[PDB]
């Protein structure tokens, strides 16, 4: 059997797996614990991808398809209907054992990004292009990636073509106010109000008391308004890619990992790397973890559930 290992990346060399953002700090939250069941950045330790997790960093919260038509409405803004496919270009098959097309956002909110188009037809001999700011509401009833059809809005009121290859590039969030409906741990309704979600990645929770989830925290930009929103992933995208590569069989339900300062070789704190792909620590405090960014996680050994984590 192939020996299990982690990639040797420092905290400043990691990216979020739920949004295309760099990892800023480590984060715990024993208080106000919610049901953690994200779908992006989900990978078991033996290299099995779960939920809507895919390998491309540019595929996270991304969409590719064609704009069908302009939605006529008297409400503010200009809404456009868009059929979505797989990221590679192939049509999305809803009979597949996936909650949504891979890369689909796994939280409620207004995703702020850029819609770009490149025409299929050529005019005497280059295709025309266009790109505008756009917002995608994942809480909307029109947000149905499972049915291969979502809907986005623009400030532009005309310059969007129909039947042309469309790409969505995630930038951040439009707003985090009351009516914005931004909740990090609230899964979107992939099929809308039609039916409930299926083929989801399993929920995540610490088993032993006194232990809490250890998150990789990234701060996400805002189009406007007040706030300092953040996105927490279970594992960075580099870990997802690495675990998929080695495909090492898990010997235990929990693996002990150590956050080591490479300059002095010191172990700052311990952590439990669980089989399904998440970290737990024995910490009482909350908020950001004070630790050098040049520090990295190192796999120590597989352990039984008799082992107790060091106080953090």
């Amino acid at each position, epitope marked *: 059997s192939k020996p299990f290992t982690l990639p040797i990346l420092t905290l400043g060399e990691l990216t979020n797996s739920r949004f295309p953002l760099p990892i800023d700090v480590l984060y715990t939250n024993p208080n106000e614990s919610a049901i953690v069941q994200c779908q992006n950045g989900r990978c078991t330790l033996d290299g099995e991808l779960q939920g809507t997790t895919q390998l491309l960093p540019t595929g996270i919260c991304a969409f590719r398809g064609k704009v069908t038509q302009q939605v006529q409405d008297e409400h503010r803004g200009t809404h456009w209907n868009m059929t979505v496919t797989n990221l590679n270009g192939t049509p999305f098959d809803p009979t597949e054992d996936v909650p949504a097309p891979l890369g689909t956002p796994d939280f409620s909110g207004q995703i702020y990004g850029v819609i770009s188009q490149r025409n299929t037809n050529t005019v005497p001999n280059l295709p025309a292009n266009r790109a505008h700011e756009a917002v995608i509401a994942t809480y909307s009833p029109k947000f149905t990636p499972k049915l291969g059809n979502i809907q986005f809005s623009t400030w532009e009121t005309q310059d969007v073509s129909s039947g042309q290859p469309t790409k969505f590039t995630p930038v951040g969030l439009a707003s985090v106010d009351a009516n914005s409906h931004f909740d990090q741990w609230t899964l979107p309704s992939y099929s809308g109000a039609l039916t409930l979600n299926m083929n989801l990645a399993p929920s995540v929770a610490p088993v032993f008391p006194g232990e809490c989830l250890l998150f990789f925290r990234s701060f996400i930009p805002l189009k406007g308004g007040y706030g300092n929103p953040a996105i927490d992933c279970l594992m960075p995208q580099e870990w997802v890619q690495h675990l998929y590569q080695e495909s090492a069989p898990s010997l235990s339900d929990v693996a002990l990992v*150590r956050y*080591v300062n490479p300059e002095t*070789g*010191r*172990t*700052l*704190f*311990e952590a439990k790397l669980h089989r399904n792909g998440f970290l737990t620590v024995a910490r009482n405090s909350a908020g950001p973890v004070v630790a050098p960014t040049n520090g990295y996680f190192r796999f*120590d*050994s597989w*352990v039984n559930q*008799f*082992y*107790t984590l*060091a*106080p953090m």
Partner: nanobody
Amino acid sequence: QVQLQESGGGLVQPGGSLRLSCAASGTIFSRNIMGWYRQAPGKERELVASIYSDRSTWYAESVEGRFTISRDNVKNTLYLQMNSLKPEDTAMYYCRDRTLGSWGQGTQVTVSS
């Protein structure tokens, strides 16, 4: 026949130096994680230092910079150098095989005038 025996405990003046040892027997010493605990009267058993298979070390914030833990895989002995002692360090020090879970008898360390 698995037993851990501590040695080198006693009384000493504050700001002095003291060294503790722990001879392990009947274990796969080099593979296991070793650590030093202490227990003050009215307090719980708090982890002080811990050493791993790759000889990496961990220390508590109320100990860092003063104590030093090391291991000898040849003689299967665990050490703990204690420099610049304080009256707050007065407790019962136990050595433990954190991997296997086996404790030791524990020795007494007191620092007063």
